Design a protein around this ligand. Structure first.
Ligand SMILES: Nc1ncnc2c1ncn2[C@H]1C[C@H](O)[C@@H](CO)O1
Ligand SMILES: Nc1ncnc2c1ncn2[C@H]1C[C@H](O)[C@@H](CO)O1
Ligand SMILES: Nc1ncnc2c1ncn2[C@H]1C[C@H](O)[C@@H](CO)O1
Ligand SMILES: Nc1ncnc2c1ncn2[C@H]1C[C@H](O)[C@@H](CO)O1
Ligand SMILES: Nc1ncnc2c1ncn2[C@H]1C[C@H](O)[C@@H](CO)O1
Ligand SMILES: Nc1ncnc2c1ncn2[C@H]1C[C@H](O)[C@@H](CO)O1
Ligand SMILES: [Co+2]
Ligand SMILES: [Co+2]
Ligand SMILES: [Co+2]
Ligand SMILES: [Co+2]
Ligand SMILES: [Co+2]
Ligand SMILES: [Co+2]
Ligand SMILES: [Co+2]
Ligand SMILES: [Co+2]
Ligand SMILES: [Co+2]
Ligand SMILES: [Co+2]
Ligand SMILES: [Co+2]
Ligand SMILES: [Co+2]
Ligand SMILES: [Co+2]
Ligand SMILES: [Co+2]
Ligand SMILES: [Co+2]
Ligand SMILES: [Co+2]
Ligand SMILES: [Co+2]
Ligand SMILES: [Co+2]
Lengths: 173, 173, 173, 173, 173, 173
């Protein structure tokens, strides 16, 4: 069950996202993690977040979905509380080092990472989603991203900077 | 959670299979279910199985993976006993009519269906799998298909006919 | 010429549709037949059509385009009366069992099947068609679907139910 | 029916080949015609064929499959003598200018063109064909290409040069 | 460095265009050159250009991007004056025969070819471009195509015919 | 010319690699950079390289090909000494921050990064390359990777560990 080899970790590029949504091509978790890392780096710096917080979010962004090399990438609505608790233990066996980073992550770094994880999905579907259901998922994810940020421990000024950067970015995507 | 609309059921063609395996293109559950239905029809008749048993397996084959319109298509190794029990209840809420057909299916029809469900995957990867991991998965699925058939309630003569047809088919695929 | 083997019938997933229309990906006849079957099942029941009529349309839907494993999937405008008469005889040699089902099909089951065969194409292009010509073909097929239904032997109440379901479905596709 | 506009002729790149054969991607008739033209140019010159003969074959190669913008690209085995006679008249209405070039083509230019038309298909499948059926079609086309060349009006020395170039080319493709 | 073999020239279909722009699929230089040739042929004749000028533009269109079999297809904005001078010498070593045709091309044939080379790209992106950046590139290329034509040695009447045909074509693409 | 915006950096996933080589799909520079980063992290640690050296190679791996968002991804054989000198200055204007990291990189970190940059390409083509030319490029890149490592400043023990890990990885890819 545990992922221990580089040949297995390289299969991040063989893991297809958007399993229940029509898209122009099958996006993999490697390109997703690189783009989430990029957003953490750029938007964490734009929001004036502490260097240690941005570094922690970037480090997590690069490996955060590695358990999907075994589990597959399940659609967010499927992950109900009872399923997520079972998945938490399974993912801890698959990628113990990722579980350790997750357990150490400061709340501010977690909120920067989660904002970027969701923003990357909205930005991806803006270009590559096909059809009414994909349109609805893109808009639902944007609504969820905003609500989570608004209710987060991030300072209002930081939330505003993140939304300022997100809106500017999606307009040119 | 429950699937109630034709526009949702049509999304069987938007559900991508092989979420953790490299393939030439993203196969969807609609083409998979049609091919499993075809194998149940042809191989059930070739094995001289009772018409009622073949009909039951074909009817189940056409809708068996419909819950994946909500859950996504998780890789078989991920479905451990504890996860499968949680998934059974969730899938019963998603597609109650499919759960009812599954609960009514006779053991012989279930074994014909399962043999065809797995054979379709091996046949698909024979043409469309890419790389060492896909090669291993194709061979593991074939080994699992054979072991399940060998330990099933199907008569030895029926198991032999099914293996006779499977081997002839894969050689020309 | 005759299709006699399961390895040949499995090639329904190797037969590409939309040979002269730009699309996001090459849809195959297996996913098409599964979706047409689904529409016959759901919309035949929604329209309150007799169970025997719905069953006949569903049975035909699952195999109706199998001759295309040999002929290829020719674009509808190409099939003029003189060509269709030649193709009828060729297809009868390729898939005699499909020709027998076609010859037995009741007019009401044929009209439910044809409405669903065309509706599936319009629904597919709504999501996956690319460009002006694909847009025109999607709209021409919808116009043809409506005209055929309006001039059919189906009761006005059944035609209205089918159009009610079609419009609701395409709006969410 | 007649193709009269540049926007229609540009749809050569929207016409998918290999309608009944599994391939890595959908090759269009525009890339096919360019490659057939290239083979006529290079191999006609390598075989020392008269400049007028090579020019005629190249000119035909560039437009030879244009009627498929309306008809679709039917698989060669489907084109039986009776169907080909009906298709000849239909294609003459679709592309009268292509029909005129075909009617004027000298036997030697026709044989250079046909050798290149078939060789391009074998070369394409060598790289992009997937599965047993595609393998068989690639080998059947090569056998047909050789038999037609061997029975043609081309001088033995020209046939040998064409086969010499074909074998060298496929080895490095 | 020099391209000398037919197996290398056949790789025109392995050279992907739009290296920095999101598209529905990877268009190759073979389909591009065929479409540019088609536009030169049709639009050169529609504009009443001399037969020798149209022939020269068509001949160049068919081979003009062959050096990209070695260089790759670099995005137009990247080709600054200093880089283009270095590339001119490299391309002359790669495809000496293409360099000779380019050096012989009359200004009017060059302007017909360049108008068609750019128009083909705008027409391609109209159907197959994805996202804001692809939209901007499509519109920038159209602006560049118009400005170059307006400042060219072509007679105003010829420029008007070319724009008349371009606008009619894109409206139906 | 300079890349200054996150919406531009996100286009790493719109930059297609392998511009002159046939592949199963168009790999982008984002998935490439993530995989190169992964190889630097895992193989740098496996080789017992100093933590500061591994960190420097990983940091460079994540952004090393960002200038290709403007330049496109040119094939390695095209980058001759004279072209590389011109490209060095252009890339310094496009991504000044990447140029600064490159200028600061220690020789050992550069050799770990370059080994991983090339190994990722060989591993990618092992699964996704199509045809004779792609096969030759995969083998040429492996030969180049080995020769550069053998002539590098890395200790023989480190070179042996890197080759030990590379061979184990490719066997299971
Ligand atoms: N509402 C949704 N419906 C369907 N798919 C969705 C939805 N939200 C996220 N996703 C996808 C994106 C990733 O593949 C995965 C989350 O990591 O789930
Ligand atoms: N051993 C395996 N590794 C990875 N993927 C596998 C394996 N076996 C089956 N699959 C896929 C096929 C379907 O998408 C899905 C089962 O419905 O899981
Ligand atoms: N007007 C049309 N133009 C082009 N293609 C069309 C048109 N109508 C249907 N099709 C396609 C759909 C199937 O592939 C096939 C019919 O089974 O033809
Ligand atoms: N034996 C064959 N089986 C299936 N497809 C074949 C066969 N030979 C040629 N083709 C394809 C290639 C073109 O798409 C088209 C001929 O222009 O038919
Ligand atoms: N402004 C642009 N930005 C990005 N890509 C562009 C642009 N203009 C042309 N192209 C592409 C088209 C061909 O692949 C190639 C020119 O032969 O460059
Ligand atoms: N010998 C070669 N022939 C063709 N393409 C090659 C070769 N070596 C590398 N590549 C590709 C890989 C990247 O896209 C790019 C280098 O970053 O060039
Ligand atoms: Co996920
Ligand atoms: Co994620
Ligand atoms: Co601010
Ligand atoms: Co499944
Ligand atoms: Co299944
Ligand atoms: Co028997
Ligand atoms: Co059809
Ligand atoms: Co049909
Ligand atoms: Co009603
Ligand atoms: Co054809
Ligand atoms: Co042809
Ligand atoms: Co000779
Ligand atoms: Co170019
Ligand atoms: Co060009
Ligand atoms: Co005029
Ligand atoms: Co590069
Ligand atoms: Co690189
Ligand atoms: Co060691």
């Amino acid at each position: 069950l545990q992922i221990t080899e580089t040949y297995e970790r390289l299969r991040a590029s063989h893991i297809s996202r958007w399993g229940i949504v029509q898209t122009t091509y099958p996006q993999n978790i490697a390109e997703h993690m690189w783009r989430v890392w990029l957003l953490c780096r750029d938007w964490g710096a734009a929001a004036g977040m502490p260097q240690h917080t941005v570094r922690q979010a970037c480090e997590f962004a690069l490996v955060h979905d590695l358990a999907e090399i075994r589990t597959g990438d399940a659609p967010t609505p499927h992950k109900t509380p009872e399923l997520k608790e079972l998945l938490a233990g399974i993912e801890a066996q698959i990628v113990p080092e990722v579980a350790e980073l997750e357990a150490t992550m400061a709340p501010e770094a977690r909120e920067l990472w989660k904002f970027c994880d969701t923003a990357e999905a909205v930005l991806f579907l803006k270009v590559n989603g096909l059809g009414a259901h994909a349109y609805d998922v893109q808009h639902l994810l944007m609504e969820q991203m905003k609500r989570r940020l608004m209710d987060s421990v991030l300072d209002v000024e930081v939330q505003d900077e993140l939304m300022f950067q997100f809106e500017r970015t999606i307009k040119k995507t």
